[PDB]
Amino acid sequence: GQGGGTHSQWNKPSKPKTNMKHMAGAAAAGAVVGGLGGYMLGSAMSRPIIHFGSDYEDRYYRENMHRYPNQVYYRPMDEYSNQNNFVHDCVNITIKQHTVTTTTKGENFTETDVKMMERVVEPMCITQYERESQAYYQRGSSHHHHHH
Numbered sequence: 001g002q003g004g005g006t007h008s009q010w011n012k013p014s015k016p017k018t019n020m021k022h023m024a025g026a027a028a029a030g031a032v033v034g035g036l037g038g039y040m041l042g043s044a045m046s047r048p049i050i051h052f053g054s055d056y057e058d059r060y061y062r063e064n065m066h067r068y069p070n071q072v073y074y075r076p077m078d079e080y081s082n083q084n085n086f087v088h089d090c091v092n093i094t095i096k097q098h099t100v101t102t103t104t105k106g107e108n109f110t111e112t113d114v115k116m117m118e119r120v121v122e123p124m125c126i127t128q129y130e131r132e133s134q135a136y137y138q139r140g141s142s143h144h145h146h147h148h
Contacts, residue, residue, distance in 0.1 A: 036073070036093060044070045048123040050116075061116050067109070068117045069098045072124045087125040094121045 047070050050061050073090040080089075095117050099109055109117060138144070 036096060039073050039075065039093060041071055042074050042128065045124055045127045048120060048127075050119050050123075057116075060112070061119070064113055064116060065120075067102070067113065068120050069094060070120075070124075072121050072128075074128070084126065084129065087129065088122070090125045091118060091121045094125075 047065070050058060052058050052061075071094075073093045075086045075089050075093075077085060079085055095114070099114060099117060102108065135144075
């Protein structure tokens with residue numbers, strides 16, 4: 001047609017407003033879960049050796065080591081605000097499932113053993129960062145060519 005003129009202009013559509021009904025729910029339902037619900041487990045690392053400095057603790061840790069896990073849980077970065085957020089979180093959680101694995105026989109871990117369990121998982125949770133620590137270190141040494 002003659003004349004014309006851009007009196008209006010289009011744009012890509014926006015997300016729907018939603019939030020109209022049934023706000024609660026979704027996801028899985030039913031507490032018939034023997035696991036931690038919303039968690040995952042990672043592969044083993046080369047089993048660490050704790051170095052407490054006290055003769056008793058470094059000695060004794062290695063005696064019961066077969067009862068302690070050599071794998072740790074993992075969590076998303078969505079939680080809290082720290083690069084290491086997932087680390088000390090998986091420390092606590094890893095032991096949750098592992099300490100009960102013996103209680104099915106009526107056995108338990110003593111205070112010392114349960115603390116030893118909690119201690120092995122500390123350097124194991126941070127080794128995940130160590131595996132990519134070069135992405136942090138080399139970043140200063142050279143301009144990383146992969147975009148970010």
